[PDB]
Amino acid sequence: SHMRILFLSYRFNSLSQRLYCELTEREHEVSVELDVHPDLTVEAAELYKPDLIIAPFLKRKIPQEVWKKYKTLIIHPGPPGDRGPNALDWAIMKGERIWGVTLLEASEEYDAGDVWAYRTFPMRFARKASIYRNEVTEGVVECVLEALENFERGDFKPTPQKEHWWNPKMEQELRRVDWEQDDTKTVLRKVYASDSQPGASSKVLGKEVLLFNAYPEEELKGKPGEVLALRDEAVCIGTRDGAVWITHMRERKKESIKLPSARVLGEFLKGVKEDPIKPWEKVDFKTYREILYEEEDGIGFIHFNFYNGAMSTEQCYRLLETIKYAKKRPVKAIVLLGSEDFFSNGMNLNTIENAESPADESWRNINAIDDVCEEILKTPDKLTVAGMQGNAGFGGVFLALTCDLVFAREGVVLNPHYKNFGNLYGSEFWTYTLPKRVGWEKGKEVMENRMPISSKKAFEIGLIDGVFGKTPKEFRQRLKERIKNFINSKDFYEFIEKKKKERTSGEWLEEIQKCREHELEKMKLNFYGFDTSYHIARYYFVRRKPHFRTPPYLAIHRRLKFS
């Protein structure tokens, strides 16, 4: 009753990773062929001979010789009959109240195959990636699981399409932000529809950029088109009726790096000064707050909204400062909440690659993230909690594991490994935390494994402490109650006195230092040594270079002993 399934993915992205967990944790075998070349895709199908092919994320036609021979199902992020490559972009730009996803057969005509499954859902006014990672992904899981049952039943007939409409690839003239004709609702709509690819073109300070990650501004006003303010490298720009923050941009030039706005504009920003708001301040108006600290019921909650979960060196220090502020407050627990889209993805490879010496910036970034980790570990008199509302990868996973307790929302996917970025040893105290949670035997096993694992699986194997909630609000609410209940019990004071004993002794303190030394000595080699596979992987990832091979850890069918 177990299927052999082949994924064709342009990139092994968040949706492909979630489907991989859902299918393999039901004891199907999934092999992945990245979309490298049509002849390689033909070979992959003939090698693997799947029962079923699923294309979760595809950027071009599947060769007829594949899908005429192997049942091939295609994910389309629009409701049935919707066709074309930017379904979600158009739904956001048109303001569709209701949207959907459709699982359909490959066909000669684009998006014209018979329908196997579909779901619909109400839209949010939100980033396309947010819709994609939540409503679309959850819709797609449901569709795929349904089609797996249908496939194994045996007499299923898909439903041919009836009405159909075509939306083209959306041109940048459509996305383009005109600061004088566009109110804030319109700017948000265009950036949302273009986030996190391909960005909304615009002219800022007479400079051509792509705009990512917008936020409204009810307070500051100014000339439409002028930079009103700076804040944690985000710029505030006047709109036809208000203002809007733009945290990230990139130069409108091929293979340019997406970066915080201040690092793109550069010396166009002489003179513009900061408008800081410390995360523990309260305001009554909508603005942009990267980090937010809020106290409730004896709990200090640290939200940190780092774009794509990447923590640059400076962002790490802002978080370290907020943690240190929280540890001086009269709270029994401190909770790291990340953002709704990501808990954390470790070091910011984009700021690293953009530095004059990526090696040097990697050294600053990994020491800064370790400093955050070490601050959390050295908290003897408070409960520490990591609350993963969204996915976590690389250092981000292990930042969480420094907390006393780790909880994840349902549907969260973890990537608790580094070697996919060419041989990184990793740090973030993983050599102290992972064996403490799971033992070395089980520990080496998961980090040698290079594939994602669900928060459910992480829970089963003891990597995290619980999974619950379907939405971020529901998760935060149930988390707040679990913590509130604990910090008002005997087990809390027992716990704290035991934790105070451990983390004030010189033994534990030097065991902690020696783990950091060991990890950073290996990380020094990754960064400065003869082997440069980390810097090479970084280059292709950050620059969105296409793949030239599928490595064997993804492609079962490209392995030696493969029979």
Numbering used by the authors: -1 to 561
Can you list sentences taken from the study reporting this PDB entry?
CoA is constitutively bound in HypX, which will act as the prosthetic group for CO biosynthesis through the formation and the decarbonylation of formyl-CoA. CO produced by HypX is used as a ligand of the iron in the NiFe(CN)2(CO) center of NiFe hydrogenases.
While CoA adopts the folded conformation in HypX, an “extended conformation” of CoA, in which the ADP and pantetheine moieties are extended in a linear fashion, is observed in some CoA-dependent enzymes. Ala392 and Ile419 are located near the cysteamine moiety of the folded form of CoA, whose positions correspond to “a neck of a bottle” accommodating the pantetheine moiety of CoA in the folded form. Replacing Ala392 and Ile419 with Phe will narrow “the neck of a bottle”, which will destabilize the folded conformation of CoA by a steric hindrance. We solved the crystal structure of the A392F-I419F variant at a resolution of 2.3 Å. Though the electron density of a part of the pantetheine moiety was not observed clearly, that of the ADP moiety was clearly observed, by which we were able to identify the conformation of CoA in this variant. In this structure, the relative orientation between the adenosine and pantetheine moieties of CoA is different from that in wild-type HypX though the position of the adenosine moiety is the same as wild-type.
